[PDB]
Write a protein that binds this ligand. Structure first.
Ligand SMILES: Cc1c[nH]c2ncnc(NCC3(O)CCCC3)c12
Ligand SMILES: [Cl-]
Length: 167
């Protein structure tokens, strides 16, 4: 039993809800919130820009130190950093950004990072400003993640189409 509430169940292990991931994380304070990161951990917009804003830029400060030490992530890769006031940990996951010409096949590799965590709050990887089809992203999520994932979809109109088209 967990404190995730109001989710529609899609599979044994995948759940979904129309919700602002920022407001969800503050309410639940999950063990892991997933960020839709880029390789530079520059949290300028999208889910990443919103989460960082909610941390009063502490996420960005921590991220800049991480990059200065370790260099950029790989597309499809991840790192675990602090969750600040939103969660215990933030799993920064880099899905391919179609608006940069990045290979969409790397989306499966990106979702594989979720399997290292028993329970996560997460957005659809490569959706929104990363330019991929959110329906496809949901399919890859369901077919790749085996741990318990609570997907937050910000757009109510997008949320309804995702549910209404799920096979
Ligand atoms: C930008 C943002 C703020 N809070 C959020 N919570 C969950 N998802 C998000 N953006 C990913 C989308 O696919 C959902 C609708 C268009 C992009 C956000
Ligand atoms: Cl977005």
């Amino acid at each position: 039993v967990n404190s995730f509430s109001g989710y529609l169940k899609l599979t044994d292990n995948v759940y979904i809800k129309n919700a602002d991931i920022v407001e969800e994380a503050k309410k639940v304070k999950p063990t892991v919130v997933v960020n839709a990161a880029n390789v530079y951990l520059k949290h300028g917009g999208g889910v990443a820009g919103a989460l960082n804003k909610a941390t009063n830029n502490a996420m960005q400060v921590e991220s800049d130190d991480y990059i200065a030490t370790n260099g950029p992530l790989k597309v499809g890769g991840s790192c675990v950093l602090s969750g600040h006031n939103l969660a215990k940990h933030c799993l920064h996951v880099v899905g391919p950004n179609v608006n940069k010409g990045e290979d969409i096949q790397l989306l499966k590799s990106a979702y594989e990072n979720f399997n290292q965590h028993e329970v996560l709050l997460a957005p659809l990887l490569s959706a929104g400003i990363f330019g991929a089809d959110p329906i496809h992203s949901l399919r890859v999520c369901v077919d790749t993640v085996r741990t318990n994932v609570y997907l937050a979809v910000f757009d109510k109109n997008l949320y309804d189409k995702l549910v209404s088209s799920f096979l």
